[PDB]
Design an enzyme around this catalytic site. Sequence first.
Site, short mmCIF file in Angstrom:
data_model
loop_
_atom_site.label_atom_id
_atom_site.label_comp_id
_atom_site.label_asym_id
_atom_site.label_seq_id
_atom_site.Cartn_x
_atom_site.Cartn_y
_atom_site.Cartn_z
N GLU B 63 -1.67 -10.06 -9.82
CA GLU B 63 -2.02 -8.72 -9.34
C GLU B 63 -3.12 -8.76 -8.30
O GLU B 63 -3.04 -8.04 -7.31
CB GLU B 63 -2.39 -7.76 -10.48
CG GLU B 63 -2.63 -6.33 -10.02
CD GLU B 63 -3.53 -5.48 -10.91
OE1 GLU B 63 -4.63 -5.95 -11.27
OE2 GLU B 63 -3.17 -4.31 -11.17
N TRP B 85 2.74 -2.23 -12.71
CA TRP B 85 2.82 -1.12 -11.76
C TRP B 85 4.18 -0.39 -11.74
O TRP B 85 4.40 0.45 -10.85
CB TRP B 85 2.42 -1.58 -10.35
CG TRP B 85 0.95 -1.81 -10.18
CD1 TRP B 85 0.28 -2.97 -10.41
CD2 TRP B 85 -0.03 -0.85 -9.74
NE1 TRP B 85 -1.06 -2.80 -10.13
CE2 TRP B 85 -1.27 -1.52 -9.71
CE3 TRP B 85 0.03 0.49 -9.36
CZ2 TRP B 85 -2.45 -0.88 -9.32
CZ3 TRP B 85 -1.13 1.12 -8.95
CH2 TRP B 85 -2.35 0.45 -8.96
N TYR B 98 -5.06 0.03 -3.96
CA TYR B 98 -6.09 -1.02 -3.82
C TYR B 98 -5.89 -2.01 -2.67
O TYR B 98 -6.80 -2.19 -1.87
CB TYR B 98 -6.28 -1.83 -5.13
CG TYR B 98 -6.70 -1.02 -6.33
CD1 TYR B 98 -8.02 -0.58 -6.47
CD2 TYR B 98 -5.79 -0.68 -7.31
CE1 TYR B 98 -8.41 0.17 -7.58
CE2 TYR B 98 -6.15 0.10 -8.40
CZ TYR B 98 -7.47 0.52 -8.53
OH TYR B 98 -7.82 1.28 -9.61
N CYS B 158 -8.85 3.67 -10.55
CA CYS B 158 -9.79 3.61 -11.68
C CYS B 158 -11.01 2.87 -11.26
O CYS B 158 -12.09 3.13 -11.77
CB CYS B 158 -9.15 2.93 -12.89
SG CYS B 158 -7.91 3.93 -13.73
N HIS B 159 -10.82 1.84 -10.42
CA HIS B 159 -11.86 0.94 -9.90
C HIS B 159 -12.28 1.49 -8.56
O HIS B 159 -11.67 1.17 -7.54
CB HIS B 159 -11.32 -0.49 -9.81
CG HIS B 159 -10.63 -0.95 -11.05
ND1 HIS B 159 -9.26 -1.24 -11.07
CD2 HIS B 159 -11.12 -1.07 -12.31
CE1 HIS B 159 -8.98 -1.58 -12.32
NE2 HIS B 159 -10.06 -1.53 -13.10
N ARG B 178 -14.38 4.54 -13.09
CA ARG B 178 -14.41 5.95 -13.47
C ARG B 178 -13.69 6.27 -14.78
O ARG B 178 -14.04 7.24 -15.43
CB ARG B 178 -13.82 6.83 -12.35
CG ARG B 178 -12.34 6.53 -12.05
CD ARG B 178 -11.67 7.63 -11.28
NE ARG B 178 -10.24 7.38 -11.17
CZ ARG B 178 -9.34 7.75 -12.07
NH1 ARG B 178 -9.70 8.44 -13.14
NH2 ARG B 178 -8.07 7.46 -11.89
N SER B 179 -12.61 5.53 -15.08
CA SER B 179 -11.76 5.74 -16.25
C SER B 179 -11.46 4.38 -16.84
O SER B 179 -10.95 3.49 -16.16
CB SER B 179 -10.47 6.43 -15.84
OG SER B 179 -9.68 6.73 -16.96
N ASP B 181 -9.71 2.59 -20.15
CA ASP B 181 -8.93 2.48 -21.38
C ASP B 181 -9.46 1.24 -22.07
O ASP B 181 -9.20 0.13 -21.61
CB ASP B 181 -7.43 2.34 -21.08
CG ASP B 181 -6.52 2.07 -22.28
OD1 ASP B 181 -6.93 2.40 -23.43
OD2 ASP B 181 -5.40 1.59 -22.06
N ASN B 189 -9.29 -5.52 -16.62
CA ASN B 189 -10.28 -5.16 -15.61
C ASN B 189 -11.45 -6.14 -15.56
O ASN B 189 -11.82 -6.51 -14.47
CB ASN B 189 -10.75 -3.71 -15.81
CG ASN B 189 -9.64 -2.71 -16.05
OD1 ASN B 189 -8.55 -2.78 -15.46
ND2 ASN B 189 -9.85 -1.81 -16.97
N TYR B 221 -7.11 5.37 -26.79
CA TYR B 221 -6.01 6.30 -27.05
C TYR B 221 -5.87 6.42 -28.55
O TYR B 221 -5.98 5.42 -29.24
CB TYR B 221 -4.71 5.87 -26.35
CG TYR B 221 -4.72 6.20 -24.87
CD1 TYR B 221 -4.30 7.45 -24.41
CD2 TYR B 221 -5.24 5.31 -23.94
CE1 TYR B 221 -4.34 7.77 -23.06
CE2 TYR B 221 -5.28 5.62 -22.59
CZ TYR B 221 -4.83 6.85 -22.15
OH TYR B 221 -4.85 7.14 -20.81
#
Lengths: 264, 272
Positions: B63, B85, B98, B158-159, B178-179, B181, B189, B221
């Site tokens: 990725e 993705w 990205y 998110c990044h 920002r977000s 999981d 990440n 979650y």
Amino acid sequence: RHDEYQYLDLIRQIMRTGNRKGGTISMFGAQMRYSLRDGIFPLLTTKRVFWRGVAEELLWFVRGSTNAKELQEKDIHIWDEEGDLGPVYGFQWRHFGAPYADMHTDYTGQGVDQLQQVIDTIKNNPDDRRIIMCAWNPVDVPKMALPPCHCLCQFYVANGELSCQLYQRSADMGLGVPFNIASYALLTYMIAHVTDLKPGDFVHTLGDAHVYSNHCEALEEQLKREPRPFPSLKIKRKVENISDFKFEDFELDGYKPHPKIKME
Amino acid sequence: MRHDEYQYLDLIRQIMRTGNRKGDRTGTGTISMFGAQMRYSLRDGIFPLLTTKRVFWRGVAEELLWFVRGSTNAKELQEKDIHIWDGDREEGDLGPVYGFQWRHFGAPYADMHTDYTGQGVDQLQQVIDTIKNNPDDRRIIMCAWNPVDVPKMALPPCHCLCQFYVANGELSCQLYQRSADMGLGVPFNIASYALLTYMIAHVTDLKPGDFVHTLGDAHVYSNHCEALEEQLKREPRPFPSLKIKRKVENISDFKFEDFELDGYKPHPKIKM
């Protein structure tokens, strides 16, 4: 334990284990949390902070202004054609992506009004994880007089509380950091007010956190000071829009700091 | 001092115990907290690939190589059996994600087949140059958060941003997420940005320092809570080591085979 101890513990940590560069002593990556609840305003007390400068500068950003003369007019010399700063904070917040011409240009309806977008998102979808206002513009940063220290801020809503997190790429622990805490703590209070929410927390995230070597003797003197209870902040009247705030609308009660310290 | 994975573990525990519940507890629902920060050492070949649950290493590396290429084509990943993705333009076209923001920030997006060479700001090559020429610079930033392009993307990034720092011949990186999981997201990440730091350190002749992971909305979650409780019962194992097998001149010249991940011994994978 008083929230201001996070700030002092970091200065202490930097001066003792930080990296010397040629003149600063620095560390990379830090995070503080300041409660904004029950009217508490985190205006740091171990050294007097320029409150009028904090408030007037933020109102100037909210207006969308890129004219340093509008601050000089208020006897604010923090930002000292002439007065034209380029597409800085006020332009990025209200007009992100718009072509920059000059400080006199009418930019109404040009670019992304991130400030109004964040306010609308808080009201319509408070659970949204994209409530971001970004001043770091890779396209506009070479056109700016100074690159922004305050890269972005994120907002969060839980139990009728509005929280804010600032990402600061460069943080002067001496003069910079206390002023920066107050600016974004005031912004939260303003957005909370117009979105019918209560202020929660201010999360201060730092990139390059540093002290100037010539300020170290003064910081050693400041580290010996005990933080005093933080002042309270009230917004005197119902303000409908974020652009409608005036300095006089703010009521800062009980600010009792230790004397100012000279840091050249 | 104590295993770096305990920061990640303690946060999951803290979120599940004192976090704020949002949305439907039947599925889409979350338990969250706002504002967190972890520090992962990357020194002496240490690679922070989390051990309480096996992380998809090949997915992480492929990725990242796809982001570095500046690709916005999900088919290029599917080709390498990467389906991260998969979940009004062509199939596989993810919009200005990205890869695009890193290599061509500000350039107008058409499609994944468009030649964007020389268009927009190449922030990845800019961070490289700044690390080399002025390592003390406090503006070594790569921003994927584009307010202009965020409505035209498949998923908003998110990044948001990452900053680089140089001290004592060490390259450190800080990511603003920002977000986050906590379950599936966050370990992947950590690895992604620790790998990026290793790559940039290599081409800039520096040693990896720290990876600082800053979080905005940190969440688990509700449907993953049973699996996370089982994971919290697990003790972290020593992190693997990472070596780059050959001398790679440019950031765009890395291949999956160039990476040598030694001694990755995680606990089994958990379905989430």
